[PDB]
């Protein structure tokens, strides 16, 4: 039943008595459900340390992973270039999924095409698919460049992307001068960030490898900036803004900020902004190249150091106070531009916010997860805040990254209770937050289920989720946020301290029970 003036959606409509009785009848009659006491016993068991040991003994099963596959990162990288169509050679279902994933995170159109390889291509290869698809894409969506990656089907059958594209050009399917950079992006290797790395290296190779004769390092008085896999628009914007305030000439390579934030003014813009082909061609003339997320830009680093001959600085991701300081000082040294008074004042204001909020931040225990560079930047900032990271999970991390993070933790008295987990998923993390309960989680939307689980053990065991990372599907416009620089540190600090304060307010909202501590002033 529905009251026309107070229509109910699924919640709370299915809490109506008739629906409740119907669901009870369905369960009792036909579901053959396990008894509720058995379900409670098994759940309690899943919260135990013994279950945690069994869970961490997993070798073949992965449950609730915290990573995606390479072509997703390849598509994100390709979207950062001017009038560029991401083109995944392989099966179309992958492209449907990539597009929907990015649509839900960014709440924006995401342009990507597939050559729709099918059973016939599984034996004969997808060369005809490549020829037809390149021609159709160029004719229909008129990009200035088509950036090609692969689905796992094409990788397994061993489709030669270079040969396929060269044959497409030779047979006249696309013009010879039309730029078609490519990158093999096997989904069974690494993760989405690896696909971003491979795609960027492929594009940079396409535009620079055969024209290095006339390049002179430092000719253009600029610094190349490679952002890596980045899903906060504010991060691109803050890097560009900070470099502008320093008066530092820069080239942001793979800049998708415009195309992921087009205005709603009655017109659909398939393309907007992005790194121009001329910028990529002139990139070897830069003073140096700075990789914002070095731990997934290894192949790009090797190409840039070995071909462009740039002396890429050893810089951590510019997250938090110390690492933003190091980034800015390295930029000052490379460019010769002093750090201006505006950035010094912004740093001082971040320090002021830290001083104002340290009493609520100090000693707070966090589990967290995400990509390696993001995770280590978050850990470093939490250590700078006096917070205690307890469970540090990076599903797509490696042993060298783990060693670096352990060194960072050992550099601080606030990291003595921390453990770093690589190759572990969010079911492992669920066990961790049950057996060694933190105050909060920091992660993507998939953490909400963990919170749900913890609440089912009881309100006292609930671990609230703070949504920082990718993907965030159950909140709106968080992709506009910033995590890098002093501005990003300010935003993260505000989110953390206010999450703590909202939790405290919730715990002290009980009248005559806990509201003695429901302070007006915090």
């Amino acid at each position: 039943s529905q009251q026309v003036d107070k229509i109910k959606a699924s919640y709370p409509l299915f809490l109506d008595q008739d629906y409740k009785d119907m669901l009870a009848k369905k369960r009792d009659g036909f579901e053959e459900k396990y008894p509720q006491d058995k379900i409670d016993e098994v759940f309690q068991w899943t919260t135990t340390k013994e279950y945690q040991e069994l869970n961490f003994q997993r070798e073949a099963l992965t449950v609730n992973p915290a990573k995606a596959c390479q072509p997703l990162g390849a598509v994100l990288c390709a979207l950062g270039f001017e009038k560029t169509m991401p083109y995944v050679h392989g099966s179309q279902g992958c492209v449907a999924y990539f597009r929907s994933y990015f649509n839900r995170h960014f709440r924006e159109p995401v342009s990507c095409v597939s050559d729709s390889m099918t059973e016939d291509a599984a034996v004969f290869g997808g060369q005809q698919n490549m020829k037809d698809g390149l021609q159709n894409c160029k004719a229909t969506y008129k990009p200035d460049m088509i950036a090609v990656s692969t689905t796992c089907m094409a990788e397994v059958i061993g489709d030669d992307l270079n040969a396929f594209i060269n044959n497409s050009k030779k047979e006249g399917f696309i013009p010879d001068e039309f730029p078609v950079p490519f990158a093999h992006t096997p989904s069974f290797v690494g993760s989405h960030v690896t696909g971003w790395d491979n795609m960027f290296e492929g594009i940079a190779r396409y535009f620079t490898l055969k024209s290095m004769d006339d390049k002179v390092v430092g000719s253009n008085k600029k610094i190349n900036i490679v952002p890596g896999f980045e899903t906060y628009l504010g991060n691109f914007r803050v890097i560009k803004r900070m470099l502008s305030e320093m008066g530092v000439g820069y080239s942001l390579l793979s800049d998708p900020e415009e195309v992921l934030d087009t205005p709603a003014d009655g017109q659909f813009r398939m393309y907007a902004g992005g790194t121009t082909q001329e910028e990529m061609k002139d990139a070897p003339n830069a003073l140096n190249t700075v990789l914002l997320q070095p731990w997934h830009l290894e192949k790009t680093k090797k190409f840039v150091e070995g071909t462009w001959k740039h002396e890429v600085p050893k810089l951590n991701i510019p997250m938090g106070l110390d690492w933003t300081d190091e980034f800015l000082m390295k930029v000052s040294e490379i460019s010769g531009q002093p750090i201006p008074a505006s950035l010094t004042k912004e740093r001082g204001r971040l320090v002021d916010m830290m001083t104002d909020s340290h009493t609520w931040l100090h000693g707070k225990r966090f589990a967290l997860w995400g990509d390696p560079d993001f995770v280590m930047g978050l850990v470093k900032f939490l250590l700078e805040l006096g917070c205690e990271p307890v469970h540090i999970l990076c599903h797509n991390g490696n042993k060298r990254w783990k060693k670096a993070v352990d060194a960072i933790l050992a550099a601080s008295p606030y990291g003595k209770n921390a453990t770093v987990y690589i190759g572990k998923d969010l079911w492992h993390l669920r066990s961790l937050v049950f057996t060694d309960k933190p105050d909060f989680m920091i992660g993507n939307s998939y953490g909400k289920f963990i919170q749900r689980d913890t609440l089912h053990k009881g309100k006292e065991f609930e671990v609230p989720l703070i949504r920082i990372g990718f993907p965030i599907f159950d909140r709106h416009h968080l992709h506009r946020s910033t995590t890098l620089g002093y501005e990003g540190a300010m935003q993260i600090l505000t989110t953390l301290v206010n999450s703590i304060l909202e939790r405290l307010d919730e715990e002290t909202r009980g009248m005559q029970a806990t509201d003695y501590n429901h302070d007006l002033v915090r």
């Binding site: 669901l23 579901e31 459900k33 759940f43 992973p65 990573k67 597009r99 290797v189 017109q267």
Partner: protein, 477 residues
């Protein structure tokens, strides 16, 4: 527009295509003639997508794991292969269920073998057996396991059937190998067929020799309702109010036991013909169970379907059907009285997967709205046979529409509202056209039944008449 105008628009849209793509796409665009009974002579469907044209279609894995198997709540569905497919489809489809997630229900969880390079080179069958053992250890209350093959499984020569057989025999467990590799077929449709065949081969016949289930003459099974936003529940309450006993639900809020009990029912009520007609036909041949298509979208279709269903049973069911119709008449009449004046005459074009492009027309017409265009991602010719009579004359039908095609069609037709998926929503929101997600119900719903109709009318009004649409033009421009 006239038929000639729509034909001209189709011709101008196709001009940008290369010759092969143009010739192919010409057969998938049509002007509706409601008198046509054989849609093959007007349009072609269920064909290979044209490469590089930004299709909206998914893959067979989406049709099998995402659509059919995934919603089965007390089973554990392993996305067998690399991590991507399981990750992108995790909790993306709002197939609602009641359970304790991670304990006795597992719908929103992503179970995967997370294939690495060594798995590709040397195979993952040993890994699959080890994974099954670990699943049994860590989720002891699961009532079955399905193994949904991703693309690499069928390319590296893996034999998931033998692993499933051996592990199921050893563990006394139903382990269903599904060969739904993404490269198979041309869309999610073959995924539906493969999933239906897997259900038939590994689950459906479990209780063939079992006669302990007490059966009644009013035993029905809801087939092909995946409980999007509780849709199936909103349907079920009506059928039980009519005096019927809904033994099974396929597969929204579905359990393996009700699937096994389905061969015991008296009637199979098929909502989504496209995804479950295979298993419905098999059940008719094997168990002699009649099946009938029905439509619970909007009061007119709901009343017609309730009466058609009650006609299959005795007089008591018919009397209870009339009581249900009378009980709900004031509610949906109030909904119409409130919302039809705000929606009368508004034009909508739809593009959805396999059933909803034709099934939701009646609800829009109940709100006074007119569907001027419709099309399918992966429908077959029988679906187009069904929808040609439903659509108005000289309306635009599109099969496997490309992004360019749909954008141009919308620009020319200029509908008041568009109902499609997440990959078109923001495109058409940029152009200032109100958009409603007709896959996920825009995280609203249910839309089935009378309560669903109330929600549907409220949502259509809130999106179509939202103030935001009058603000896309800056006053200084």
């Amino acid at each position: 527009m006239s038929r000639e105008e729509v034909e001209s628009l189709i011709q101008e849209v196709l001009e940008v295509y290369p010759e092969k793509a143009r010739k192919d796409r010409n057969k998938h665009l049509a002007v509706n003639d409601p008198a046509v009974t054989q849609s093959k002579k007007c349009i072609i469907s269920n064909k290979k997508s044209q490469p590089g044209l930004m299709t909206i279609r998914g893959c067979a894995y989406a049709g099998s794991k995402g659509v059919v198997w995934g919603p089965i709540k007390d089973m554990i569905h392993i996305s067998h292969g690399p991590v991507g497919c399981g990750q992108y489809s995790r909790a993306g489809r709002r197939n609602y269920y009641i359970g304790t997630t991670g304990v006795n229900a597992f719908v929103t969880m992503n179970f995967t073998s997370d294939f690495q390079e060594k798995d590709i080179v040397f195979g993952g069958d040993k890994k699959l057996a080890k994974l099954i053992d670990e699943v049994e250890t860590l989720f002891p209350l699961n009532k079955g396991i399905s193994v949904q093959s991703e693309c690499p499984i069928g390319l590296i020569g893996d034999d998931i059937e033998s692993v499933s057989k051996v592990k199921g025999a050893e563990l006394s467990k139903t382990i269903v190998p599904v060969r739904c590799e993404g490269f198979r077929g041309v869309s999610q449709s073959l995924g539906h067929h493969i999933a239906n065949d897997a259900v038939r081969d590994w689950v459906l016949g479990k209780r063939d020799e079992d006669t302990t289930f007490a059966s009644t003459p009013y035993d029905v099974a809801i087939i092909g309702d995946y409980n999007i936003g509780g849709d199936a529940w909103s349907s079920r309450i009506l059928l039980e109010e009519m005096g019927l006993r809904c033994v099974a639900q396929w597969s929204g809020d579905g359990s393996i036991s009700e699937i096994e009990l389905t061969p015991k029912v008296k009637l199979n009520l098929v909502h989504c013909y496209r995804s479950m007609n295979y298993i419905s036909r098999h059940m008719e041949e094997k168990y002699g169970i009649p099946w009938m298509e029905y439509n619970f979208f909007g009061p007119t279709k709901t009343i017609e379907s309730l009466r058609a269903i009650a006609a299959k049973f005795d007089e008591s069911i018919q009397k209870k059907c009339e009581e249900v119709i009378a009980k709900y008449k004031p509610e949906w009449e109030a909904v119409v009285a409130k919302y039809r004046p705000r929606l009368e005459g508004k034009r909508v074009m739809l593009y959805i997967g396999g059933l909803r492009p034709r099934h939701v027309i009646g609800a829009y017409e109940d709100l006074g709205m007119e569907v001027v265009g419709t099309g399918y991602e992966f429908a077959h010719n029988d679906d187009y046979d069904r929808t040609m009579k439903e659509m108005g004359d000289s309306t635009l039908l599109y099969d496997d529409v490309t992004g360019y095609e749909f954008e141009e069609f919308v620009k020319r037709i200029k509908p008041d509202l568009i109902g499609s998926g997440i990959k078109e929503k923001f495109i058409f929101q940029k152009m200032g056209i109100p958009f409603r997600e007709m896959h996920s119900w825009d995280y609203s719903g249910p839309y089935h039944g009378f309560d669903g109709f109330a929600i549907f009318a409220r949502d259509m009004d809130m999106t179509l008449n939202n103030p935001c649409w009058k603000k896309l033009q800056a006053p200084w421009e």
